[PDB]
Amino acid sequence: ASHLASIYGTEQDKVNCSFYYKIGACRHGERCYRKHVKPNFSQTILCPNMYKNPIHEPNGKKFTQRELAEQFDAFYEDMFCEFSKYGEVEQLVVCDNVGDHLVGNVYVRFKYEESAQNAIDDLNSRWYSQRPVYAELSPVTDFREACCRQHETSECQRGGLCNFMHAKKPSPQLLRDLVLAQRKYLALNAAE
Amino acid sequence: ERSVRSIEQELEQLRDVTPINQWKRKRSLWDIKPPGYELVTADQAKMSGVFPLPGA
RNA sequence: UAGGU
Ligand SMILES: [Zn+2]
Ligand SMILES: [Zn+2]
């Protein structure tokens, strides 16, 4: 009795795609009959199919577990550093799915909405790993409502074809060194 | 003003961390184009259809 | 047109 109930962006909302409202990518894409509302102002950007996991290649079944961890850290390091030139980065998530709408997707949430707009304006003209970069604003705000719950604990029984984000987390050493490195870069540009 | 004080309060705690704009990336794959595409821009490559997304 | 309010 304190507030009116609603079903916006929910799985019970049958005119808006709930999966695009929370995850930022739907399995049907442009052919979905439910609404995909693309924001004009957003803090989160999307780079679809940017992380090519070597495990899903014809010859990438030769690396050990330690070599795989350093390779993924080399990718996350290369991602976080480049996105930091467009402003402050609050969170960076990399999806390890195989579905055509979420495989290797890279989500970046900036602190300011103008920082996100300047990022997609420049990324759409750049390259990465011999491939053109696709960039767009994504309606994702809270990653907890988009991550797979049964994947954080143990593994999801749906495997790589899960429609929720199977985020591949990096090493804690790299994540800590990146947040501290960004704070110094922001402090050194504030002293003027 | 306390802003300049708080700024030079955190820089000293970060005396032995490299700022992110300096970090030397050994093999960064940014701006690396496929062979022959040195004159092709990224926008022309997407419209050409040779680089489609997995959804299409 | 789903498993996630
Ligand atoms: Zn949809
Ligand atoms: Zn899952």
Numbering used by the authors:
A (entry chain A): 2 to 193
B (entry chain B): 106 to 161
Give excerpts from the publication.
On the other hand, U2AF small subunit, U2AF1, binds to the 3′ side of the boundary sequence between the exon and intron, known as the 3′ splice site (3′SS). Then, the recognition of 3′SS by U2AF1 is a critical step for the determination of the excluded intron for the production of mature mRNA. U2AF1 consists of conserved three domains, an N-terminal zinc finger (ZF1), a U2AF homology motif (UHM), and a C-terminal zinc finger (ZF2). As U2AF1 was stabilized by the binding of U2AF223, structural and biochemical experiments were carried out with a complex of Schizosaccharomyces pombe U2AF1 with the short fragment of U2AF2 spanning residues 93–161 (the U2AF1 complex), as previously reported.
One of the hot spot for such mutations is Ser34 in U2AF1; replacement of Ser34 with Tyr or Phe residues induces aberrant splicing. To elucidate further the impaired RNA recognition mechanism of the S34F/Y mutants, we attempted to crystallize the S34Y mutant with bound RNA (5′-UAGGU, 5′-AAGGU, or 5′-CAGGU). This mutant was chosen because its solubility is higher than that of S34F mutant, making it more likely to find suitable crystallization conditions. Although the 5′-AAGGU and 5′-CAGGU complexes did not crystallize, the crystal structure of the complex between the S34Y mutant and 5′-UAGGU was determined. In the complex, O4-carbonyl oxygen of −3U maintains a hydrogen bond with the amide proton of the mutated residue (Tyr34), despite a small but distinct position shift of the uridine base compared to that in wild-type U2AF1. Along with the imidazole ring of His29, the aromatic ring of Tyr34 also stacks against the −3U base, forming a π–π interaction that is absent from the wild-type complex. The S34Y and S34F mutants therefore bind 5′-UAAGGU with an affinity similar to that of wild-type protein for 5′-UUAGGU. In contrast to wild-type U2AF1, therefore, the S34Y and S34F mutants show little discrimination for the base at −3 position, except for rejecting guanosine. The S34F/Y mutations clearly allow much greater flexibility in the selection of splice sites with U, C, or A at the −3 position.
